[PDB]
From a paper:
The cyclic oligonucleotide-based antiphage signalling system ([name]) and the pyrimidine cyclase system for antiphage resistance (Pycsar) are antiphage defence systems in diverse bacteria that use cyclic nucleotide signals to induce cell death and prevent viral propagation. Here we show that phages encode anti-[name] (Acb) and anti-Pycsar (Apyc) proteins that counteract defence by specifically degrading cyclic nucleotide signals that activate host immunity. Using a biochemical screen of 57 phages in Escherichia coli and Bacillus subtilis, we discover Acb1 from phage T4 and [name] from phage SBSphiJ as founding members of distinct families of immune evasion proteins. We confirmed the critical role for [name] metal-coordinating residues and identified E74 and Y112 from the opposing protomer as further catalytic residues required for cCMP hydrolysis and release of the reaction product 5′-CMP. Together, these findings demonstrate that Acb1 and [name] constitute separate families of immune evasion proteins and explain the distinct reaction mechanisms that degrade [name] or Pycsar cyclic nucleotide signals.
To compare mechanisms of anti-[name] and anti-Pycsar evasion, we determined the crystal structure of [name] from the phage Bsp38 (2.7 Å) as well as structures of Paenibacillus [name] proteins (1.5 Å and 1.8 Å). In a structure of Paenibacillus [name] co-crystallized in the presence of nonhydrolysable cAMP, we observed strong electron density near the Zn2+ ions and more diffuse density in the nucleobase pocket, consistent with specific coordination of the phosphate and ribose backbone of cyclic mononucleotides and weaker nucleobase specificity within the enzyme active site. Structures of [name] reveal a metal-dependent cyclic NMP phosphodiesterase that uses relaxed specificity to target Pycsar cyclic pyrimidine mononucleotide signals. We identified 107 proteins related to [name] present in phage genomes and also found many closely related bacterial proteins encoded in diverse bacterial orders. Similar to SBSphiJ [name], closely related phage and bacterial [name]-like proteins cleaved cyclic mononucleotides with broad specificity. Structural comparison of [name] and B. subtilis YhfI also reveals that [name] enzymes contain an extended loop that reaches into the nucleotide-binding pocket, potentially enabling stable binding of smaller cyclic pyrimidine substrates.
Numbering used by the authors:
A (entry chain A), B (entry chain A): 2 to 245
The structure:
């Protein structure tokens, strides 16, 4: 059975919680979903070696989702030398390398492209990929920063992992209505206007049945002020291991 | 009098110590020297608001020195809106923006260049700059990664801050002999071959008088195994406030 453990559950600036990055365990296969500036410290905190990461999947380009990749890449290069598999949309490959990782990683005789530190495997929007015997993943293009591609994930045909996105209640409802969706992991912006994130006020306007599927992530340091005030939804606990 | 507090004293992969980033205090003026993936968490740990950072100086492009700049930039943009001053060599401006920060920070109507999030002030190699009444800083070009510009700092005409560099004992000796150098903060690679860092074995070959000036930084998680074995040198303590 698939297992999920969040390395962190926090929004980009939270300090009680690490960056919102997920570990999925399918048998011996370990997928890291996003790898922010705190992911190395978070891995250390739960006692997980970078050698145990079989693949990394990148949902969009922001420091709390890609800022730890340089450390992961170098440590694997200097350790066993095994390049982690990197799952990513084609339209994020060039920005991730050319505008994010190249500055620190590149070195004349040594590292020239993403392929020198990762085993790059492109995912196509709405084309499911069997990552491992019990782990199927489908990218869904969703909005976050205008003009920048960002993605959510549909897992094993029944788990929606929102990653970072603005409010899309028809998407949620359609996944539950047409695609068998049973569990939803949704980011939430607890205070302020939802310009590039989904607010708690927005999620509370969802129908009761959709709220019952939702565990909340990517949240700020005031999360404890809201415990018990999220209707039928609840907050993911950082480092807890969930089955499914 | 000038004061120094390391946000972290660790090498790039250390987990007992944060990334090797320095705070300098000259009266009310606060300079951050480098801003790695751990710098936001380290600032939080010592209770320092990002609003108190008056300027940031970048010695070279690596995640443990620039990987926290995206979070600093965004938090200042969304907070008081005051752009931090960024001191940097001209030949690092384009790689820092185009190949490191642009991917996550850029946004069509909003952020197009480094100047949209920083007040960029170029430093010239070997041209001292008075940052504040009691803080003069001079970039010295030193080797670290072949083909990449990286810099050390000469402060108030008498403090050498090595930042990241390979072994340059004639430089040290010449600064002590010709330029009045009284204190040296030097990176150290405790184990392994010194390909892009200075090893402890190398520093131990320095003359006794030069060792007496040196406090060690950028060190790995096995630092405590070496305490008392560094001749007349000693290890910097993370978060201690030093006068000078
Ligand atoms: Zn995020
Ligand atoms: Zn984001
Ligand atoms: Zn370094
Ligand atoms: Zn470096």
């Amino acid at each position: 059975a698939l297992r999920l453990q969040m390395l962190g559950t926090g929004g980009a600036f939270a300090k009680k919680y690490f960056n919102n990055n997920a570990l999925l365990y399918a048998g011996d296969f370990t997928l890291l979903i996003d790898c922010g500036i705190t992911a190395p410290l978070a891995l250390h905190t739960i006692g997980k070696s970078v050698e145990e990461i079989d693949a990394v999947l990148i949902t969009h380009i922001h420091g709390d989702h890609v800022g730890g990749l340089e450390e992961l890449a170098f440590r694997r290069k200097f350790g066993s030398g095994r390049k982690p598999i990197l799952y990513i949309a084609e339209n994020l490959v060039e920005p991730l390398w050319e505008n994010t990782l190249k500055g620190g990683l590149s070195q004349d005789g040594v590292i020239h492209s993403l392929n020198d530190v990762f085993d790059v495997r492109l995912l196509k929007e709405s084309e499911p990929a069997q990552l491992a015997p019990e782990l199927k993943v489908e990218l869904i293009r969703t909005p976050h920063i205008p003009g920048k591609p960002s993605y959510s994930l549909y897992i094993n045909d029944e788990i929606f992992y929102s990653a970072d996105m603005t409010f899309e209640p028809e998407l949620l409802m359609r996944l539950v209505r047409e695609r068998g969706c049973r569990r939803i992991f949704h980011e939430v912006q607890l205070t302020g206007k939802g310009e590039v994130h989904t607010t708690l006020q927005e999620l509370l306007s969802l129908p009761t049945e959709i709220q019952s599927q939702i565990l909340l992530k990517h949240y700020s340091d005031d999360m404890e002020s809201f415990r018990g005030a999220t209707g039928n939804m609840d907050f993911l606990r950082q480092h807890e291991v969930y089955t499914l």
